[PDB]
Design a binder for this molecule. Structure first.
Ligand SMILES: C[C@@H](CC(=O)N1CCC(O)(Cn2cnc3cc(Cl)ccc3c2=O)CC1)c1ccccc1
Ligand SMILES: [Zn+2]
Ligand SMILES: [Zn+2]
Length: 330
């Protein structure tokens, strides 16, 4: 708030990963400005996620005390005790982004979400007997990686695109060719500017094995067609962590908001400086605390995502409605 210039959020309940995700989205400047320009004039008071998300971001940018999220949770109706224990973190990122993306249709910033988090991949099926291949284009906003028996992110990506053999009792129904031996896999067509990677650490029991991830991650090796104009080099932006015996822990997140390597810890309402080692290597696991989700930004688009945002980037109409609500509380 004063020691770092950043204000955290107060844990109003058992929200688990929620507070960690909000700070990550808030420091996605390119995404932040898009939400400020959302037409939320005649939206419901406390029944609109886009509006309720706008308020949080504004209070985060201006307020000097810990920010609250009570109104936000009720926005999407997760007020039950076990609400968060029955949902993955990416499920909330998808729930949040889908609501704002729909509310942004037809404006100047429509489609901003796919521009930042949307990527293209291809799932296929190839058989060695005949010559029938079936490809399927798909879109992805978050990537679920496996970490059991995986040393680092490199091996995890290798297993993600690894080919699977459909033979023996798992032969592929080649349609007119009957059961056939084939192999199935997936390939990465493109990588979005902002990369969200969830680590499969909750396979009903938390696993605390050691998993390594670098500050700079080159992903050109996993693309179908490389582009010398823009390499697939990504920079670590945020690290969400958790420590606990299978059912409860302190949810902390590490961030370098400007992408300059100056990291900070966000224990809800307590924001403080920290070393890059405490944010990266100290969260590999092996202690007993380990990260469960990573955020990477394309090196070429780092300045675009983290562009500077001032108080002039918020419409005057929204500022009054937000100030009028805060003032009305007085
Ligand atoms: C208490 C929870 C925190 C929490 O409630 N959650 C749900 C779990 C997470 O989404 C990570 N995760 C874990 N396992 C997966 C398995 C498959 Cl198959 C696909 C996706 C995932 C995945 O995303 C994080 C958010 C936790 C358990 C274990 C380790 C760390 C945290
Ligand atoms: Zn996400
Ligand atoms: Zn704390």
């Amino acid at each position: 708030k004063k020691h770092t210039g950043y204000v955290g959020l107060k844990n109003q309940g058992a929200t688990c990963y929620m507070n960690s995700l909000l700070q990550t989205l808030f420091f996605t400047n390119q995404l932040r400005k898009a939400v400020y320009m959302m037409p939320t004039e005649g939206d419901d008071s406390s029944k609109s996620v886009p509006l309720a998300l706008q308020r949080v971001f504004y209070e985060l940018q201006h307020s000097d005390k810990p920010v609250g999220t009570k109104k936000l949770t009720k926005s999407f109706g997760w007020e039950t005790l076990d609400s968060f224990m029955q949902h993955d973190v990416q499920e909330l990122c998808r729930v949040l982004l889908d609501n704002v993306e729909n509310k942004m249709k037809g404006t100047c910033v429509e489609g901003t979400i796919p521009k930042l988090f949307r990527g293209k991949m291809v799932s296929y099926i190839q058989c060695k007997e005949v010559d029938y291949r079936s490809d399927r284009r798909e879109d992805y906003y978050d990537i679920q990686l496996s970490i059991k028996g995986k040393k680092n992110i490199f091996e995890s990506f290798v297993d993600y695109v690894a080919v699977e053999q459909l033979d023996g009792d798992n032969k592929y129904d080649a349609g007119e060719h009957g059961l056939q031996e084939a192999e199935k896999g997936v390939k990465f067509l493109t990588l979005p500017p902002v990369l969200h990677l969830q680590l499969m650490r909750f396979m009903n029991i938390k696993i605390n094995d050691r998993f390594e991830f670098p500050e700079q991650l080159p992903l050109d090796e996993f693309l179908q067609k490389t582009d010398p104009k823009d390499p697939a080099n990504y920079i670590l932006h945020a690290v969400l962590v958790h420590s606990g015996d299978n059912h409860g822990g302190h949810y902390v997140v590490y961030l370098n908001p400007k992408g300059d390597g100056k990291w900070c810890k966000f224990d809800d309402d307590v924001v403080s400086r920290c070393t890059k080692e405490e944010a990266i290597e100290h969260n590999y696991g092996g202690h007993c605390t380990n990260a469960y989700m990573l955020v990477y930004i394309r090196e070429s688009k780092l300045s675009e995502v983290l562009q500077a945002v001032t108080d002039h980037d918020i419409p005057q109409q929204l500022v009054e409605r937000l100030q009028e609500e805060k003032r009305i509380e007085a």
